[PDB]
Amino acid sequence: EVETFAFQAEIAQLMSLIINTFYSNKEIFLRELISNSSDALDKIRYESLTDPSKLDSGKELHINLIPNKQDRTLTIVDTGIGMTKADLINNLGTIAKSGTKAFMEALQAGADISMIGQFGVGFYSAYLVAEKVTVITKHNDDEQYAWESSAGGSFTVRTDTGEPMGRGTKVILHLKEDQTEYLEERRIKEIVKKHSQFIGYPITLFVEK
């Protein structure tokens, strides 16, 4: 059912650095996650040009931002290519190894945490604001999976039994108690206008009722 994995040593080191460094420019996490969603949308868009049946699992190519004050969660949903079990457990972590090592050397050489995206490890900036991150994903070639980590050196992967998503990735940020500003409509709008004004897919902010 649920399998537990150890993060690659370098990624575990980067995650503890992100969690324990005093750094007030935390809003960068949202730019990084939207950029990752844009890359996944680019991939499915590109593949569909030679195989239009890749869009049978959904033609709409977009990003949704869903704050939820009651649950203290910020969800970023996209209809990109999605991730396989191999991506989640091995392949994305393997590729992230060099970028993680390089990023930590750069930080030691005086670089700022905001440069994280230049090293292909932008995702991990989610741990500036989140105590736990849940990622639900569905790739055309595989089953729906749920990845999760509260850091501490491990992550879990399980087959997801929840609502089918067709194709794409849903990033669920379980925010730290002092990071609730990222659930505010005006705050999300400000961040998106400042960092993500030039993304080639519609970004829809879901207003709470």
Ligand SMILES: CO[C@H]1CCCN(C(=O)c2n[nH]c3cc(O)c(C(=O)N(C)c4ccc(N5CCOCC5)cc4)cc23)C1
């Ligand atoms: C446990 O899950 C996490 C495992 C660690 C890496 N993760 C993310 O970086 C991530 N954050 N938000 C996303 C949204 C998405 O749609 C996807 C996605 O489906 N794919 C295919 C995807 C995969 C890789 C990238 N790259 C961005 C540039 O840096 C090199 C990786 C981009 C999109 C992934 C993410 C996900």
